[PDB]
Design a protein around this ligand. Sequence first.
Ligand SMILES: O=C(O)C1=C[C@@H](O)[C@@H](O)[C@H](O)C1
Length: 498
Amino acid sequence: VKNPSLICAPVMADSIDKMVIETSKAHELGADLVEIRLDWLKDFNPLEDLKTIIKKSPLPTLFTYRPKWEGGQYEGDENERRDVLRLAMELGADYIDVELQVASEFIKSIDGKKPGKFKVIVSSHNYQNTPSVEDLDGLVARIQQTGADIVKIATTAVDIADVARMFHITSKAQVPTIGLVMGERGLMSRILCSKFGGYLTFGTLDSSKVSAPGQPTIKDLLDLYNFRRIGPDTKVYGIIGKPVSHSKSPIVHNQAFKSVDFNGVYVHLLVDNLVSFLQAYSSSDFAGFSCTIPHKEAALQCCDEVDPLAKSIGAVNTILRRKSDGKLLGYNTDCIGSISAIEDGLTVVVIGAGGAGKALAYGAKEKGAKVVIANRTYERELAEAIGALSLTDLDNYEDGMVLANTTSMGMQPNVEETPISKDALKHYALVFDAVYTPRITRLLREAEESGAITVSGSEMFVRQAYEQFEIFTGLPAPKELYWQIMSKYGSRENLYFQ
Ligand SMILES: O=C(O)C1=C[C@@H](O)[C@@H](O)[C@H](O)C1
């Protein structure tokens, strides 16, 4: 609905001097406006303080005086609370956010007294779930009926599938609408606003200044997710998994898309149920996906067509939604990424029997010496599917062997977790670890201390990544670019996007 989404920054410092500093920071960061959360001020002299903020703020101002009964900090007299908001408006505020519950009385009180550039936002918060379209429609109608200039609705994501309902609302409501879904599972709703008609989204000054679950930083919205480039025709892609907050696929793919000016956007997709997820997002708006634990093997089942290599491997880590009919095509870029990374580093001991284990096992077989599998659950016929061992026995096992971890052991925040005793490593010439967050896992650490050579999971990550790009865009893999992007933008550790 209308203009691209605005980026609003929540200002919650407990003093006026500090809020002024925050509004400046917001301007510096690239935000379009700021929401002054008046209920967070330790000391508050309405007339004086409000006057200051409006004056010193380099950006348009939206004032909120959130009461305890609506999840805010304000306690006390309701009329006094309302007087402040009225003051804000008459002092030059660009917007005020008034709660649905009291919006009618409030808007009536300012009848024939609203400044020229003043807009009233009426909001509703649902901390339980995301209602049906039917109920959302009714809520929109109710908010409209109060005389609101802008409809504002914040719901909670029980499942990632809930976002689609919110997109339908912001995309089809014929009134300026701010629709957001809270929680990590709703993050996508905060990023794709400009594609689905959202009037505004909230971005933080930093990872610690969050006013609601799921809010990303302004910097990430602008530089990581290329927010300004997102539009109605932009195609959406994302990494499917659980957990998914550690993934850097959104970093690399978005840079690449921008670099070649491809009209696409890549986001994190926290999926609990893969089957329902793919069902909830089958429209042409969602052109492709990457898959990690625990959906690599499951994706294979959901694809309409599977690449011979993927079928032969038994798992899919890349999905493409064919424009032609609209079906899903499964591919596997893990195999070539793992094998090449390893060979470059230069009997293979594969740790893990999941999708990554399958791929790496297959490739190790197809290219030289034979391998043996070692999974937490002994049963995971894998060793006989390509020509076995129980995890606990791995410690008990030549002197120039190769070890390849494809499990999540050691992945952040489980930094002190390793899949094998450092005493065994003494028998390996090379050790690979598919885990790339952190770059140097405990395994790789004690491996280099064990005198062996180490191959980082980033080597495999970048390789399998540019192959997905080619699959997604149909453009030749810009390999050199991906190595550059990973080096310049994907080097920081302990990052969680949620
Ligand atoms: O962390 C990630 O974003 C990924 C990890 C690997 O499993 C890859 O196979 C997947 O395509 C993306």
